[PDB]
């Protein structure tokens, strides 16, 4: 039973950054040489665990997280950084025995008229603990005039939608990001 990482990375569509999903890779063998030799990958900065011995090492379990974010904000997923995409939408701890993978995806995720399906949270009263998810969409308030649920002055919708269009693509091009974290999985099993 080969691990389904090659079937989850090589997929059709993913969820937004604020509604990121997780998958539990069960007991299976996993060869990451296919991850290393893949030319389509763009950013593969792997923190913590040594890169080459990644297949050699064995851990209790591995978790796979993924989402879609702007190209210019792929840097902020790295540990020990702050911003509008890492402080609120998806926070990552100071040190984690895993690493992230990012590769460009424009044709499969952007349309000439623009895409409205992807959303990202803009307003929140406080930051998030590491590996914390929040889906609830409550009308965020300035705090002086209570909002009963009517949009207007001092009451805004917390969620906002990215706009992806064929453009310069330096930072506005949509980038797909997948996060692997290590906690019964061994690769070689010689």
């Amino acid at each position: 039973n080969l691990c389904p990482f090659g079937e989850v990375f090589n997929a059709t569509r993913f969820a937004s950054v604020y509604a990121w999903n997780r998958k539990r890779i069960s007991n299976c063998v996993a060869d990451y040489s296919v991850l290393y030799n893949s030319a389509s990958f763009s950013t593969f900065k792997c923190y913590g665990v040594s890169p080459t011995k990644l297949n050699d090492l064995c851990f209790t379990n591995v978790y796979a997280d993924s989402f879609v974010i702007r190209g210019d904000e792929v840097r902020q997923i790295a540990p020990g950084q702050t911003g509008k995409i890492a402080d609120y939408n998806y926070k990552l701890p100071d040190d984690f025995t895993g690493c992230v993978i990012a590769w460009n995806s424009n044709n499969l995720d952007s349309k000439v008229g623009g895409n409205y399906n992807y959303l990202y949270r803009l307003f929140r009263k406080s930051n998030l603990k590491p590996f914390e998810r929040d889906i609830s969409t409550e009308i965020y308030q300035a705090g002086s005039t209570p909002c009963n649920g009517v949009e207007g002055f001092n009451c805004y919708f917390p969620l906002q939608s990215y706009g992806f269009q064929p453009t310069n693509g330096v930072g506005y091009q949509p980038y797909r990001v997948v996060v692997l974290s290590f906690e019964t999985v061994c690769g070689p099993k010689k």
Partner: single-chain antibody, 222 residues
């Protein structure tokens, strides 16, 4: 009615220190954003700082470490700590509330004067006209964006700027129908159907595409 107040005027020798304050009524400082924009004499507006809810903060690389920004929920004010100065820091400081995409810098302060001891450009320049004729403005961007990150500002002499257009032709409440905007691709245009006697002012373009950075154009006068 939301209104800001500032008390920072003074004269300081190089190497001195002076602090700034901004009282806010009608909106909590902790929840809403904050931003200090600096305008050198005879120069365009320049960005200094931004405060998101929580301890996150970012500065302008031009002035890093010499400026410290902090908030205070007790007095509903934010301070701009300033331990080190130089000769080129002489300017006027404006503090305003930010809303990112859903509006940009809706309400501004009154401006305080202090004295010591991607790029955007706007073409037309003077564009002098009598009240009868119609006026159109042009400012372009070196790198294209989805046009949802643009804003237009007007600044009457001796006062503080106010919002006119945000988010790609979406006007503000109370703004007359005279002002309108339309921009696509690299060239972005604002048109004014009729010129009232009071409409004579100075207009600026804005871009908030970058998350921590906002770049202000040189601006056009009328």
């Amino acid at each position: 009615e939301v209104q800001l107040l500032q008390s920072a005027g003074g004269l300081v020798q190089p190497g001195g220190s002076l602090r700034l304050s901004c009282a806010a009524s009608g909106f909590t400082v902790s929840a809403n954003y904050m931003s200090w924009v600096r305008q050198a004499p005879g120069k365009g507006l320049e960005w200094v700082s931004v405060i998101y809810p929580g301890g996150s903060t970012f500065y302008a690389d031009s002035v890093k470490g010499r400026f410290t920004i902090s908030k205070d929920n007790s007095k509903n004010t934010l301070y701009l700590q300033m331990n080190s100065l130089r000769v080129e820091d002489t300017a006027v400081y404006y503090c305003a509330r930010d809303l990112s995409v859903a509006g940009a810098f809706d309400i501004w302060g009154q401006g305080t004067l202090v004295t010591v001891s991607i790029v955007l450009t706007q073409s037309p320049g003077t564009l002098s006209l009598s009240p009868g004729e119609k006026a159109t403005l042009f400012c372009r961007a070196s790198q294209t964006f989805s046009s949802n990150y643009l804003a237009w500002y007007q600044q009457k002499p001796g006062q503080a700027p106010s919002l006119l257009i945000y988010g790609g032709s979406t006007r503000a409440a109370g703004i007359p129908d005279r002002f309108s905007g339309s921009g696509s691709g690299t060239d972005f245009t604002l048109t004014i159907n009729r010129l009232e006697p009071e409409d004579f002012a100075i207009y600026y373009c804005q871009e908030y595409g970058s998350s921590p950075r906002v770049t202000f154009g040189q601006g056009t006068r009328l």
